[PDB]
Amino acid sequence: GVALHRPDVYLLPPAREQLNLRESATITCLVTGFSPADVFVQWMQRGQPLSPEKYVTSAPMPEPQAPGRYFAHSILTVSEEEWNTGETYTCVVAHEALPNRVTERTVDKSTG
């Protein structure tokens, strides 16, 4: 049987060098250390789901330094404007091994 291991979800704001362009902003949601490889990631803004057109979820790949565990990315690209208005974005990660079968993280410019 495949062991159940909880995912760790870290949420990273766009890099400062990307925001200097004043074009679009990329928010990355990092899901690591989970088993089985099956994982669901969804993005929400203002308590409402975003169109899947706006983000891409990577396929879960094996974490090389932890054999039985996997990782995956979900990259959301919005605009620098919205990021810098103060909009709050939420990454929702669903996985079999989580206590409540779901967890979420939230980020904006004010975190750091």
Residue numbers at the binding site for a copy of itself (CB under 8 A) = 8, 10-12, 14-18, 24, 26, 28, 30, 32, 53-56, 58-59, 61-65, 71, 73, 75, 77, 112
d(CA 13, CA 103): 19
Residue 88 interacts with, from a copy of itself, another protein, none (CB under 5-8 Å by kind): none
Order of strands, edge to edge, in the sheet holding 48-49? 48-49, 40-45, 89-94, 102-107
> What's the min distance (Å) between Cβ of 84 and another protein?
6
Q: Collapse the DSSP code of 99 into the 3-class scheme (helix H, G, I; strand E, B; otherwise coil) and give the result.
A: coil
Residue type, position 70, single letter? Y
Tell me whether residue 22 or residue 101 sits nearer to another protein (CB atom). Answer: 22
> What's the min distance (Å) between Cβ of 1 and a copy of itself?
26
Taking CA atoms, 7 is separated from 12, 35, 42, 46, 53, in Å, by 16, 8, 15, 24, 25
Residue 69 interacts with, from another protein, a copy of itself, none (CB under 5-8 Å by kind): another protein
Residue 104 interacts with, from a copy of itself, another protein, none (CB under 5-8 Å by kind): none
> What's the min distance (Å) between Cβ of 28 and a copy of itself?
7
